[PDB]
């Protein structure tokens, strides 16, 4: 009816880019023009073609390795790392055929809990962890033991420190309001008349005007938030050891710019890597409840009657009304968010009641072993493209810059048509999901019983850069004009941006 399925449209293919001298391949791609929404046709997967080429062009991809070139993986490990007892290559290709193995450390050592999670790239726009980009199981030498409690851990070479800067911060707020008003009026009257002589004349009257007018309201806002920080993590600034899969995939990138191939890079590994993080858990609880009661009562009666006796004639009227109305309403919204820890505690914290201090203790204990990543400072993944292990490193870097800039545009949810019901459209891929708040339901959040639903305004996509002499972008707010249904908070961010060409 109102929502109508929107089919995915993707661009006409780009031109075939010229055959890459090193990849001996040629590439074309389609932009996604609009995502599928409301169960519209999901177009098709594979918005990118790669073709074989014959190329005379020379390729200088033979980046020198003074070290040991791993047989299967081709990682260039330092010659000193052979026969140290660590698999610094893949498939022990550095430890194979060792006359003797000089075990760099004899003690059992753990890896820091969850450390490999941080070696994944992060899609900063989606804010989603993706494929592995750094090798946090490469130690080089290492074997300086780090004790946290009794457990001694072996720090990865990539990691500048992981350290238990343990902290926690609980915020509780409970604001209850009540109002009632309760009015009554009881007007009442009688009249009586008699006369006589031989005659009689009796005239009685009654009147009632009774009114009741009651209104009670109760409101509760109850917000609780535990922020628990259990460790702090920083990646080294320099000379990082990349993951095999990422190394390869980057080596596959063409030197001539081809957006689709870099886009596939970002969709596999994301856009950024975590250079520093705070690891912890978040528990947040927020209960909003409003209750109103209203009663209306309005009774009226009249009697008007007479009789005269001389023979007798009597006359009379009764009139009555009882108008009674009783509007009553409750609206209760509870959202619980829990991040980090064990499933058991995550779930029972996700119950609708506030927890016991016992359960908060158990949860925070578990969070130490399976922490969420509370805060990250991230650098774009092109900063990992370095001359040390890629040929044409500057070219690949620049192409990643350009592809990142375009990727940010393409992946922006703003392409999505506005959700009803103060839905939040999220671009899952070729397809956009309306996340419906509590009290909103269905594909567009169209099904909501709530009488009013304040629509916080959603920016439209930033209009393309204007030309130089004040290169500028503007936004219109048109996409979800807030005012309907009593719009809520207008968009905080910049409505327009200016840049010096």
């Amino acid at each position: 009816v109102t929502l109508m399925p929107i089919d995915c449209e993707l661009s006409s293919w780009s031109s075939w880019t010229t055959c890459d001298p090193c990849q001996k391949k040629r590439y074309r791609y389609a932009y996604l023009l609009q995502p599928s929404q409301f169960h519209g046709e999901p177009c098709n997967f594979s918005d990118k073609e790669v073709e074989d080429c014959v190329t005379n062009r020379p390729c200088r991809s033979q980046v020198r390795c003074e070290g040991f070139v791993c047989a299967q993986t081709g990682r260039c490990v330092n010659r000193r790392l052979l026969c140290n007892g660590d698999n610094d290559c893949g498939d022990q290709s550095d430890e194979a055929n060792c006359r003797r193995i000089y075990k760099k450390c004899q003690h059992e050592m753990d890896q820091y809990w969850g450390i490999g999670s941080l070696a994944s790239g992060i899609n900063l726009f989606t804010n989603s962890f993706e494929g592995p980009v750094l090798d946090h199981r490469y130690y080089a030498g290492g074997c300086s033991p780090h004790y946290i409690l009794n457990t001694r851990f072996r720090k990865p070479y990539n990691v500048e420190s992981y350290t238990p800067q343990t902290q926690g911060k609980y915020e509780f707020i409970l604001k209850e309001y009540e109002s009632y008003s309760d009015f009554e009026r009881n007007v009442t009257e009688k009249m009586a008349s008699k006369s006589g002589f031989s005659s009689q004349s009796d005239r009685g009257k009654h009147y009632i005007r009774r009114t009741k007018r009651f209104s009670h309201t109760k409101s509760v806002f109850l917000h609780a938030r535990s922020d628990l920080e259990v460790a702090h993590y920083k990646l080294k600034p320099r000379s990082l050891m990349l993951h095999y899969e990422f190394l390869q995939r980057v080596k596959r990138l063409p030197l001539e710019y081809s957006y689709g191939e870099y886009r596939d890079l970002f969709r596999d590994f994301g856009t950024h890597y975590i250079t520093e993080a705070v690891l912890g858990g978040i528990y947040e609880y927020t209960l909003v409840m409003n209750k109103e009661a209203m009663e209306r009562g309005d009774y009226t009666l009249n009697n008007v009657h007479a009789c005269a006796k001389n023979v007798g004639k009597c006359r009379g009227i009764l009139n009555e009304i009882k108008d009674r109305n009783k509007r009553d309403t409750m609206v209760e919204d509870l959202v619980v968010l829990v991040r980090g820890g064990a499933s058991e505690h995550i779930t029972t914290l996700a119950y609708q009641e506030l927890p016991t201090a016992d359960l908060m203790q158990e949860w925070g204990d578990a969070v130490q072993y399976n922490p969420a990543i509370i805060k990250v400072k991230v650098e774009p993944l092109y900063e990992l493209v370095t001359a040390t292990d890629f040929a044409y490193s500057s070219t690949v870097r620049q192409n990643m810059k350009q592809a990142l800039e375009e990727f940010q545009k393409e992946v922006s949810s703003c392409h999505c048509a506005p959700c009803q019901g103060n839905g939040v459209p999220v671009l899952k891929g070729s397809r956009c999901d309306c996340i419906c708040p509590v009290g909103s339901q269905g594909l567009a959040c169209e099904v909501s019983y709530r009488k009013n639903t304040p629509i916080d305004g959603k920016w439209n996509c930033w209009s393309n850069w204007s030309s130089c002499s004040g290169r500028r972008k503007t936004r219109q707010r048109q996409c979800n004009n807030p005012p309907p249904q009593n719009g809520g908070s207008p968009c905080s961010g910049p409505a327009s941006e200016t840049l010096d060409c």
Binding site: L318, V336, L443
Partner: protein
């Protein structure tokens, strides 16, 4: 309401059997399902696909699907040579390991770690029409020489040693080995609970009355008049929705050089490059229509309660009543009016996905902090794919390590575009009153709400019959206009009942011929 006709199941005659495929050596034929028994009636008492034994006219396909790559024996899988003698069996035969004098790699920092529990569950195919999981599409077990490990964040298992009196956490299961077919398996733990509860009540009560008399005596005689309107109205609405989903791990499948399941590899090589719908429909049947490319392991709890009651009463009366007496004569007459409309609807859904049968059932029956905790405890051991992104089963062909298979991909695409509509629940007819048509492969039923059923969820005591429509099945493709083609559908199976929601999607669709 009235039942439809319990029309019998009806099939096409058998198609003529294909030749005895050189390896399977089996005569394949199909009979298309023209119409399933819409409800009850004469079922089709047989298969739709049949496969008679034979003896082949010629040699099985060349037992040499690849050069230099080591080919296993029962399975056509081609292994890059470093996978031979790597200390783990890269194919069902073990032919890569079971004759090695020594192993080129030992992987003594992975081979202790079991595969990620539940990884096999993400590898299943998926039958969109049934929502059943199908046979393994991906290889849940092949590691491809990768030694990749996933930190098991919930490793921390409590142990007690009576001798030491030490109560401590056993360090077993600390890491799991990631199968090669996963690009990521993230193990991030999240919960979100959103709850909305809404209550609305109204009454509007309005008694209104007059009474009147005039009476005279010299005989004594009376006339009295009465007029009244008594009206009563009530509305009572309760809605509450509880949705608590608990992610325990995100995963993303590898989209490049997918290693298909060896059973799937068999079933796929065995497929002829000719559109014998019977075979292709069998492949879509047992591997299903779709395979998962991404998703989340976890649990979901959804509980919805809707109660709606309305009661309207209007009572009118007029009368005139008279006396004459001095013995007595007494008279009267009038009009009585009553009109009523009353409807009550109560509808509760409590569905729990993931977590053990017993403890998920306990949370399904009785929501409490005890059942939330025991359910979450059971989610550690038995998570489920709670959300996923999937592609049509033919789409894996383009991405499998076998390389191009385009004839078979096109044939399977066509077979799927057929199957999706031949076996579609649209053909189970008009389940009234929000009844849910399901086609159990050959027999239809309407899963009804909590009320009476005789044929089509019609007998339900729901005279407040406000219930949503559903589409008739898509009409057959138009005789295309030499390049463009159209399909038509109507919101008439059932029609939207007495103001129920019109069917949401397309009333007409169009296709390039």
């Amino acid at each position: 309401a009235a039942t439809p006709a319990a029309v019998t199941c009806q099939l096409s005659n058998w198609s003529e059997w294909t030749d005895c495929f050189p390896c399977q050596d089996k005569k394949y034929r199909h009979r298309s399902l023209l119409q399933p028994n819409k409800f009850g009636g004469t079922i089709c008492s047989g298969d739709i696909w049949d496969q008679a034994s034979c003896s082949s006219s010629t040699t099985c396909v060349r037992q040499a699907q690849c050069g230099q790559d080591f080919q296993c024996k029962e399975t056509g899988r081609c292994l890059k040579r470093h996978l031979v003698c790597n200390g783990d069996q890269d194919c069902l035969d073990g032919s890569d390991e079971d004759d090695c004098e020594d192993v080129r790699a030992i992987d003594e920092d992975c081979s202790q770690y079991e595969p990620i529990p539940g990884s096999q569950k993400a590898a299943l195919g998926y039958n969109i029409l049934t929502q059943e999981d199908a046979q393994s599409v991906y290889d849940a077990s092949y590691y491809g020489g990768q030694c990749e490990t996933v930190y098991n964040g919930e490793w921390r298992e409590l142990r007690y040693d009576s001798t030491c009196e030490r109560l401590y956490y056993g360090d077993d299961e600390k890491y799991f080995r990631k199968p090669y077919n996963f690009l990521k398996y993230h193990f991030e733990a999240l919960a979100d609970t959103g709850i909305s509860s809404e209550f609305y009540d109204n009454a509007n009560d309005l008694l209104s009355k007059v009474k009147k008399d005039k009476s005279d005596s010299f005989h004594s005689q009376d006339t009295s008049f009465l007029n009244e309107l008594n009206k009563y109205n009530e509305k009572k609405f309760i809605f509450t929705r509880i949705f608590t989903k608990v992610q325990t791990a995100h995963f993303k499948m590898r989209k490049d050089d997918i290693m298909l399941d060896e059973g799937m590899l068999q079933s796929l090589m065995e497929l002829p490059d000719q559109y014998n719908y019977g075979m292709y429909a069998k492949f879509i049947n047992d591997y299903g229509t779709h395979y998962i490319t991404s998703g989340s392991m976890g649990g979901i709890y959804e509980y919805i309660l809707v109660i709606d009651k309305a009661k309207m009463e209007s009572l009118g009366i007029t009368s005139r009543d008279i006396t004459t007496c001095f013995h007595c004569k007494k008279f009267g007459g009038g009009k009585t009016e009553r009109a009523r409309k009353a409807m009550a609807v109560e509808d509760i859904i409590s569905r729990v996905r993931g977590g053990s049968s017993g403890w998920s059932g306990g949370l399904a029956q009785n929501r409490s902090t005890i059942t939330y905790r025991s359910w979450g405890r059971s989610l550690k051991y038995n998570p489920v794919v709670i959300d996923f992104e999937m592609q049509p089963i033919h789409e894996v062909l383009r991405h499998t390590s076998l390389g191009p298979l385009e004839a078979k991909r096109q044939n399977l695409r066509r077979a799927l575009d057929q199957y999706l509509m031949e076996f579609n629940a649209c053909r189970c007819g008009p389940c009234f009153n929000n009844g849910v048509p399901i086609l159990e492969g050959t027999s239809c039923r309407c899963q009804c709400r909590l009320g009476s059923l005789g044929a089509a969820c019609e007998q339900t005591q729901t005279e407040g019959a406000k219930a949503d429509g559903s589409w008739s099945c898509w009409s057959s493709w138009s005789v295309c206009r030499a390049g463009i083609q159209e399909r038509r559908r109507e919101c008439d199976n059932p029609a939207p009942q007495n103001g129920g929601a019109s069917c949401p999607g397309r009333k007409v669709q169009t296709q390039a011929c």
